[PDB]
UniProtKB/Swiss-Prot annotation:
Gene: bamC
Keywords, alphabetical: Cell outer membrane, Lipoprotein, Membrane, Palmitate, Signal
Protein's organism: Escherichia coli (strain K12)
Protein's name in the database: Outer membrane protein assembly factor BamC
GO molecular function, one term: identical protein binding
UniProt domain comment: Contains two well-defined domains connected by a flexible linker. The C-terminal domain may serve as an important protein-binding surface for interaction with other Bam components or substrates. In addition, contains a long unstructured N-terminal region, which is required to stabilize the BamCD complex. Only the N-terminus of this protein is observed in the Bam complex in X-ray or EM structures, most of the protein must be highly mobile.
Length: 112
């Protein structure tokens, strides 16, 4: 409801994390903390630009990579959801935003 789960094939999760950092910076998204060894990072207020998005969105994301047997997975937790400074508790919206970041991660996964 507030967390997206990305399955990473070919054990690319070990190479994905640093690509996520690179892509985040490429999108001009500030990262507040990062940990290569623990493959975990936390972002600052991320503003998206959907075609039907008029209001300024803000809120943070926690991205943590976890091993899953012979494959990897990425946990993307939505830390905050504010539309024009208005907290939205709607789980559907939160899911949509949590997967909006996952989509950016999967873009870097395709590159890897």
């Amino acid at each position: 409801g507030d967390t997206a789960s990305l399955l990473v094939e070919n054990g690319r999760g070990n190479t994905l994390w640093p690509q996520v950092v690179s892509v985040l910076q490429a999108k001009n998204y500030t990262i507040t903390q990062r940990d290569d060894a623990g493959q975990t990072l936390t972002t600052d207020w991320v503003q998206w630009n959907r075609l039907d998005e008029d209001e300024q969105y803000r809120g943070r994301y926690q991205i943590s990579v976890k091993p899953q047997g012979y494959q990897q997975a990425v946990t993307v937790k939505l830390l905050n959801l504010e539309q024009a400074g208005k907290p939205v508790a709607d789980a559907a919206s939160m899911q949509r935003y949590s997967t909006e970041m996952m989509n950016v991660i999967s873009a870097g996964l395709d590159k890897s």
